[PDB]
Each structure stands twice: as C-alpha cells, then as structure tokens.
C-alpha cells in the first residue's frame with residue numbers, strides 16, 4: 001500500500017468541503033453521476049476509432065448500490081476508468097487550477113453547489129462520506145484501489161478484489177448522520193431532480209435488507 005500527500009491546494013479544498021456549514025449536501029450524487037457520464041462518453045468516443053477498447057465490456061451504464069449493513073453508497077460505471085498515473089498525479093494536477101478558481105468564486109459569493117463548474121466535483125463526496133474508496137480499471141493498466149479519509153493523504157494499492165473489466169466504483173463510506181442516502185426514495189428523488197437527462201442507463205439497486 002503506497003501513501004501519498006495531497007497537494008496543499010487539494011487538502012485545502014477537502015478541508016473546506018468537510019468544515020463549511022452547507023446544508024444542501026445532496027449535490028454530491030449529481031457530481032459523481034456527471035463524472036461517470038463523462039467517463040462513459042470518453043470510452044464510447046475512443047471505441048469509434050479503436051473498437052477493441054470495448055473488449056473489456058460493451059455495456060455503458062451506471063449503477064447506484066446502497067448497502068445498509070456496510071453503510072455505503074457505491075456509484076459504479078463502465079467508463080474509461082483511471083490509470084495509476086491519473087490516481088497519483090494527473091487528476092491532482094488538473095484539480096489545482098479548478099480548486100483555485102472555485103475558492104476565488106466562493107470568496108466572491110458562489111456556493112458549494114457550483115463545484116462541478118470548476119472540474120473538482122468529485123471532492124463533494126466528502127460532504128457525506130467519512131471515507132471514499134475508489135476501485136478503478138483502465139484498459140492496459142491494472143485494477144487499483146485508491147482511498148482517502150482526507151487528513152492530507154490518500155493511499156493507492158493494486159486491487160485483488162472482484163475483477164471489474166473496465167470502469168470505476170466510487171464507494172462512499174457514509175458519515176453516521178448521512179444515512180438518508182441509503183434510502184431508495186431519497187436516491188430516486190435526487191436523481192430525478194439533478195440527473196434526469198444523463199445519456200446512459202442508471203440502475204438504482206434495492207437493498208436486500
């Protein structure tokens with residue numbers, strides 16, 4: 001297991017997200033779904049010029065999986081996935097500029113719900129999650145598990161779990177007071193409100209209870 005420091009700017013963003021009083025936490029789902037939609041668009045586009053990129057799975061979709069036993073909400077997609085380089089360096093690099101702009105915007109009167117406009121919507125996960133575990137598989141790279149409970153560090157390891165074929169699983173380990181996001185009717189409400197025109201099937205799994 002390798003342990004890495006976030007760049008200071010990203011640590012700062014995560015702190016702001018965790019510490020700021022902001023009631024409209026539900027926007028985290030829309031951001032993650034948007035991210036999944038963008039990853040699906042990317043693999044779809046690449047497949048037009050190299051069809052073998054779908055040898056790791058032709059189906060392009062999103063699954064939302066609540067688990068009350070584990071207190072997790074998992075957002076799964078069969079998008080392009082992330083390389084080791086994405087996890088350790090590239091995403092962080094890109095996020096530095098978006099973070100600065102977002103911070104500036106917040107000082108000028110913007111609110112947290114606008115985070116996606118700055119390309120750093122993933123970190124809104126921390127509105128509701130005490131820990132985020134990301135399982136990902138990109139073509140021509142290995143399956144990785146990234147994890148962070150914030151605090152300035154994250155880990156990356158090669159994943160020995162169920163092989164995914166291609167895609168990303170964002171596993172939200174929900175805060176004790178955020179378990180409404182495990183409830184079917186609440187997830188349906190939020191998807192209808194903020195994610196109604198996504199161009200891929202979104203399947204909301206039901207709890208076995």
Ligand SMILES: COc1c(C)cnc(Cn2cnc3c(Cl)nc(N)nc32)c1C
Nearest residue numbers: 035036039080081082091122134146168
């Ligand atoms: C490791 O966790 C992330 C970090 C630290 C920053 N951004 C994203 C969003 N993100 C970036 N590329 C992504 C792809 Cl291909 N797919 C999805 N679903 N989300 C992505 C993720 C998941």
